[model samples]
Target chain A: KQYIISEELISEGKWVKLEKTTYMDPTGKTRTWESVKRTTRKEQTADGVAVIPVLQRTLHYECIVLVKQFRPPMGGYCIEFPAGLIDDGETPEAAALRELEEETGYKGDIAECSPAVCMDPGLSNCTIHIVTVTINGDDAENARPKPKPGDGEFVEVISLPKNDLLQRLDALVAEEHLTVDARVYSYALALKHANAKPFEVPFLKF
Target chain B: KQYIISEELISEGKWVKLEKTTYMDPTGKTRTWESVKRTTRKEQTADGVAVIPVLQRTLHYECIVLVKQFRPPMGGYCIEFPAGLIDDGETPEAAALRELEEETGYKGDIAECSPAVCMDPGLSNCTIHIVTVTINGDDAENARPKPKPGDGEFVEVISLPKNDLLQRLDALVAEEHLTVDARVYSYALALKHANAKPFEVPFLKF
Candidate 1:
């Protein structure tokens, strides 16, 4: 039961739209809220389609793959899991695998995919389907995931050791070298590791 | 150093703005990104300010306080940590305590606060400061946190047991009753609890 009754495109761009929506609240009251609607290739086919692709080491859950890119809004680099919009007609799992290969240059199989979850419910209607992929580190081609470069896209692939991911992130943040994405940081926390040494860096920058 | 060259307000409302920002990327490239800027009472003092308040159980690090509320954007309820915007001249800790009390009706002390971090850096300039709070459950007054009713604000306070928190959330999601916030879900994962019974609940609904 969608609550949005009417939406007006206030401003439209190549990739986004500033929209004003009038909706019925839980209390049966009508109110308006404005939000930025991010447009994707799936706009014509569906609403609220996105993905969070997680790459894990098959040898063990020793480390995970992450990406660092300079976000213009942040005016600096951001460390986050590889994620992208789910294209029209593509299942979340398929989108996840494709994005994983394009972003991290890894070939993996889906271990699991989480149900669609809201990223920021108060700010946008964007919901993400989290796909956990397992890469066989023993396979020569998969041993070290290389990042595939994209036009005008500069991403640094970081294979973060799970043991002290948070601690390493903390140090990087403290040094003003990187800003951690909330989702990526929280995933590190879920691992429950403590007092482990940080991963050595001179991270692969492409 | 701020990279925002200029901002134009296209529209305004109770707590949001449709604005176009011209900025320079790290590669010395200039581009424009249109976004919805959610304003706060602290806007007069700072450009961007937000918070994610987390409540901890003193009896053991076994559970945390979270809230379920109907978020208009997602057009449904979301399970998330209690959070609010910082008021002018108020510290993030104070705002955390105030929001925690207003939403969860519990009193707690700030344990630590993370340095300001970005939420969706690619979509908006919003950043959040995470506050970890401690609640002494041994105290009769603090043992069970309650939900405080606010004017037209319907929030359900959930005492999420750390053990199998994600699993429990998965059940609720499968039942189509709630959508877990990415940050809250990740925090639960970070606790790394395993093979525990889910909290028994006929959750409080307003």
Candidate 2:
């Protein structure tokens, strides 16, 4: 499908635009859709942060874990995987590594990285970069960055066992440790990784 | 570490409530931290949706593959994998199946669903559950549902050869498809699953 801009209107009463898109049917025929965005009020965040959060898939022998933190925006605390926004011109891998060290103080080699979307399609525009890593215990510990909570910043580190983590997932959701949509995909990923029966790389190995 | 809450007036017109959290050393002594929020604000969206967006790990063949979507919030279209919110009372497996069908119109038997965290810890308070599945082409097609876009939604699907997918991850980031942090983890899952690559069970095995 290809979208072609036909017309746009940004007037106060007309807050939408129209684009003509053509989709090639299986029969080689073209079908067109008039793409439109019809909304009266353009949504905006007062915080001014990008609002595009990030996530991690920490691979260890005993667990494929998600991390957590206290976000002032949520009005309390939240249990999320290690993630952060991308600085300009940075890749998700670079952001992931920096976030890992910045938050967990653990440094390790990245095993892989993949693309992911937010669990909620309707209400969010956040994209995820899923990074897997083999944590080297010595490097992880030695690379621990000094914990600093500058103005408006705070963090805590906790590790959950894989099965126990699954069990606690429900609790985290109910307790508001995890966001509703994030809880959905996190659980799904857990089952996927578990069924594959991955060998755990222990903290000692890291 | 432990936190002690104290009330003090640092200077005229500057009264403060200080929270000092302290961690214990190997010798059982305490390490402490103190910080302040220069400014704080909270924002919530329709349907009581928490504004704390998070990520998921969509691992296939033991690795996470990418899905693509144009994010209106970010004012651009990008590549990502299929993922979505965990509805209330639904297990992660159920939610994963639902998201898979809704987003990509594909479905399969749930393999292993487990808990995982995003790679970055500092920026988000959202926790995600990682779900894994072995999808059969037949089962997937059978499970496919007519995708109904929620209001203001659009998507496109694309696939690439496995090696090309890996090599082009960097390009994907440049094109705003993938993130830097997710690169390594995504690659690791790809490598892991690459070893035990899955096939269409519906026809191949039968």
Candidate 3:
């Protein structure tokens, strides 16, 4: 029968409480399954006034991208997305926008937050946190920069046309070009967004 | 500033060998970067081979869908593809075809075997693998069983249409409905195939 094989505390030190757990097979055997359970402390409203927690905003927004220069782990040069760890008291949406600015030299208002978890919790704790930012096409153009000079410095801020993003995603999946966690979460996000909106990203060549 | 992270042996088995890897971050500190390594392996060739060992075949092949009937991890029913462990003298193609026949009441010639490693190697020892088998549409239809009682006892034998399979994959990712390793690998396979050869697949509705 199903049994609790092991239980672990996944997160500690306030902000949130998460317990990582594993269970034995339900067939009376010793097979195991695992998961992480997360709980956040209830947020309290400020004194002297009732506040509405509901947020209403536009449904569509721009995707911020990071173009960092890196030496290959296997060898060579490669460009990648700039992502970061979620900070305390910050929503994933906030983190996405914050990172977008810090890493890409751009600024914009975050529209909304989405729900996503890490694909491989066993190896990484990072999550697929995204935010749709409101950015002007002109500002996006100004956001690009001359190639920076450094041993391991990134230079360009490429504003991917929405259609280009989908093509890149398709290429990434086809060439097996994404990391485990990114691959899983990106696919999930792509599929979700594709439902309501068509992708405008252009096709990528090798 | 950047730093080189400690090296890791991602995979080391007799059947596989290291070739190349693409690091998401090359010059940056290894603490927060991503990398992808590609490797090649010696082939387990048929007897009567020549002086040089054959490079493992990279052609596509058919895959056996296990079609397990069970309450899914996320909820609802799931049909999965279960693979048999590779035997001492059996090739991946043979094993894939055999597993397909055992799981689904249909038979066909396996064309090529595609290599895929498990996204999560830390937890599961098994690597994700796929084979592309061409189903004779006529044979597939003739093999379908008439609707009858006790059919569930024996694995139901429904040859899923290729387009339907692709649509199912899109549905699974879009709806967050995947629960098995096979589903992930199979999706990757299907996506790769679709990109390699543009074709018609069933459309998925939101």
Candidate 4:
């Protein structure tokens, strides 16, 4: 059904804008919804990309590279998949390549990419493509990535062994007082489900 | 290391406010980051929650409940888990029960709860607890649920079979042109991983 009637800009920020969307419900009831949008996103696909770097070690052992940086939104350093906004005239694949190198200092091969997916829809129109990249460990550059984070960005990269990844992620946060991006936690939990009862709903550890 | 120095309001809207934060990097460099905050959130724990309702059926097959509604930010109807903001003085479990009864018209038991997880850090200060609830189906009220979403909220409830949940979700979206919330998609992918290799990273069909 056609629910949205129109929108009005409530406030504009340096990087974001607030909009109040006038909507007519399925029942023809008129209302307004407050939404935020990223003014920086003019790309064809997504506003941002979160790169999941699979660092393979010894063919038997695999690792996932993560980035730790202070996020003002949460008021703490967040353990997140290496992420960045997509640039103008850039495909998600190209953006993932640039993000992996700058944030993790490792060159990677794109393994998989999700379509443009939204983060917080009820509150904002923030969308990103979750990309998985494989970093085959062999070269010195790939071994010890020389990360060159963008201006004003200070990032610390960590290689997490894929074995018991969920528990290891929890331990890292507990020891460092850091926050894990929800997607990162859920991604590990996906691996945790690799062995479970069919149709079983997981009981998570908060 | 403490990166935050202070924050100043950049703009204030009816439901949210934008702030610019000043911080000293881990290397003693000063910078600013922009963030959005929900002005309506004063909850002690988290700002909101997304409820996962597992509807058990036939004592063998299980079902997961879903909600579809128009999201103003994306200018389209979104397929989302039953979600709502946590009220002041209300526990997350309580909020889930209230949300399920309202959005899906089914009473659910809290099976598992996650610690507060963030959606997008580079964008906003939005936080939510992802909760899993079990809904045992054996009642008339549960059978013919009459959903009563909040004012101006028109939600379509769905019960997806837990068998091959990922493919089912994709099909629903494709058939209806509905957008799947990222967390919801990732969760179905979790169940899909149950048969995967121990160290396997999934190559999604998206």
Candidate 5:
């Protein structure tokens, strides 16, 4: 068993705080690590939620409802799943529903919700819930199709067919100079991996 | 189209720095966002790389090589893929191989490498390459696998069956009370999505 020695605050930003942690390793070796914490994390459960919204059953091709936005940090447009931070006193599913509605004009039903998943655990203690949603194309709420992003938010909605996502993402990255978020890219890769195999055997044994 | 007005530094830490970005939105609105930047990014290219190592063709079941550590940020153990920051002048593939070898004591050949993927574009300007590596289980270097974690590094290597990853991750989280990294969980979910389909049709129309 290991024990933490001490944690010292190195710097505190408006949105993030940096800390220096010293701990005893399993072999009695002491090590120090630098980590970042989000000061705005409101929920004890999750800091944010990402909703993977799928649109189907319409008179058109089945699609995954994606969103594109200008990420200030990346200084470029990012094609990613609709996601947002959780509000105080809000459940992960509720936050996912709200963010999905705000970023894309689709009121979808939550199909699955994952436990808290960490983002850059070495660098930051950020965790978010992954929610898979399905929107019936026959629903009238999605028929009008007008996304009302919150103030200061500018998002462009994208509907990519369920298949050919990997190629389409690579094409978008090449043609439009857009970047794909890891979650979206990973999911696309997953789709390719799953579909390329024999019936119902998703992963390779090797 | 949008233009960045100005970016001013708010705080600077040993490992991370915060900046306030003022940008003119496409809707003629000036918005400010606080983002973090890593100072240890060593390359003009990706700041780091993550390797997904799969072991196959041996006397045992095919398994994915994973690593776990006591992340200071999470204040708990995290189950994640083997990853590390890139060394200057090193390619992503090279970095991935080194990290994988160090963390799991397994040498692997690069099967595929991904472009730069953002970890948290909204909060950080960090990007890493995703590399998929295949390790021959019969290799001499892997017979007596012993992870050579560097000074102050304590890693518990895990080998989970390729097919039952999603369930295994859930089991680990339940039995060991560990957290799963997003990339690993996403891959698990992806595998499940692909494998649970009918005869190579990975994703649903819905």
Candidate 6:
């Protein structure tokens, strides 16, 4: 149901805007909810572009590629999948390939791509397309590629054992070294070993 | 290494803020990255609270609880785990329980909680504490709960067959009926059935 009756842009900046919207509730009651809208090139395109999260796997799926960088908002380094905003006229698949190479200095073929998914709907209007790629053993490089100079960002490419990412993450965070991104954390969970036994009933007892 | 040198709130609205930040890069060069910060009460806590995504299970883990709501940001209804921001003076666990009950009308116990995870480090400083909860078959209700009146929002509760979410989601999106949240989408991937054979080398050919 289209509940939104009208929307007013409260403020627009380079990256985001504050929007106030009037909408009807299920009971046909009218009210307002204010939210943040991320401005992107997608809106300008006939078929919207997407932010691509590239999951690069190498060493026969024994290792995965990740990037570590300091996120100013978090005030510390974050371990995350290499991701970026899709440039105008770029397909999600192409964007994923470019970001993987630019951020991690590795080239891979896109194995699968998920449709654009909302990142945080409750607060912002941002979405991402998740793309999984594969970097083969024969293609693995000995040294990390240098990031383009003057990009104003320093990134360290990390190759992690796919089977041990959870343990490694624990160590990294426990040492106060790095925090994991939600998408990266979820990827690790997905690839982790399944339970030998069925999930116990009464899974959580408060 | 703490890269954030300083942060100044540029503007604050009901939902988010534009923040200007100066930070040191790995090269010891200082630069600025302006970003959007989603405002939260948890920031005021000693250790900030979290966004809890409860994975409520019933029928011997055969099904899970989900919520569907029209998110203005996405301009459509989104299928997602019941999640909420933490309130002042409340723990993440407590917040998870409260949000689960309020949004889904079913009670559950917290089985596990992940560390604070940044949703999109590139654009926003929004973090969520993912919590997995368990609701038994006996506690499952016949009808979805009505969100508190006058909240200016309408929510529909969905009980999904645990293993069929991915297929169901594909069907929903094929007709442009719904979109899925990234985190929820990732959770579905993690719980989906695995391949009959393990992933082969050179996982991606295209």
lDDT of 1 by residue, A1-206 (tens): 33667887767766666677787766787878776667763443323322333344434545677888877666567888877777667888887787787788888788666766776777777777766677666677876666666654667777766667777788778786668887776666555322222242113222
Clashes found in each candidate (C-alpha, N, C closer than 3 A): 3, 81, 21, 0, 3, 1
**Cα interface RMSD of each candidate:** 5.4, 14.3, 10.9, 2.8, 2.0, 2.7
Using TM-score, give the best candidate's number. 5
Residue-wise C-alpha lDDT for candidate 3, range B1-206, written one tens digit per residue:
33344544443322221212323343433332233222322243311100100111123222324353332121223344434445556677776656565555445566544433333221222233445454443453425523222322234333333324444544554774433232333343324333433333222212
Per-candidate TM equals 0.80, 0.45, 0.41, 0.89, 0.92, 0.84
**Model 2 C-alpha lDDT versus the unseen true structure:** 0.41
Q: State the lDDT of candidate 3 residue by residue for A35-129, as single tens digits.
A: 32223322321001000011112343334343433343423222234444455676666666666655555555554433342323322222343
Mark the regions of model 1 whose C-alpha exceeds 4 Å error after superposition.
Answer: A1-6, A25-29, A41-61, A143-146, A192-206, B1-14, B21-31, B41-61, B143-146, B191-206
lDDT, candidate 5, A52-118, per-residue tens: 8888874566688889999998888899989998988888899988888888878889888998999
Docking quality tier of model 3: incorrect
Q: Candidate 4's residue-wise lDDT over A1-206, tens digit each?
A: 76678999988877888888887777666888888898887745678888878787553577889988888888888888898988877889999999889987899998877777778779877778778788978756676678877777778888888656778888987798677887887667656644434345433212
The numbered model that scores best in lDDT is 5
TM-score of chain A of 4: 0.91
Candidate ranking under lDDT, highest first, comes to: 5, 4, 6, 1, 2, 3
Docking class of 4: medium
Off by over 4 Å in 2: A1-67, A86-98, A109-134, A139-146, A161-206, B1-69, B74-76, B79-206
* 3 versus 4: better TM-score goes to: 4
**Mind giving the per-residue lDDT tens digits that candidate 5 earns over B7-54?**
898777777778888888896868888888888876468789888888
Per-residue lDDT of A90 in model 4? 82
lDDT of 4 at A138: 77
lDDT per residue, candidate 6, A44-155, as tens digits?
3312222223334333445667888888877778998777778877888887777777776676777777887887777777777877676644643623454442276567
TM-score of 2: 0.45
TM-score, chain B, model 6, is 0.80
For model 6, the local distance difference test gives: 0.66
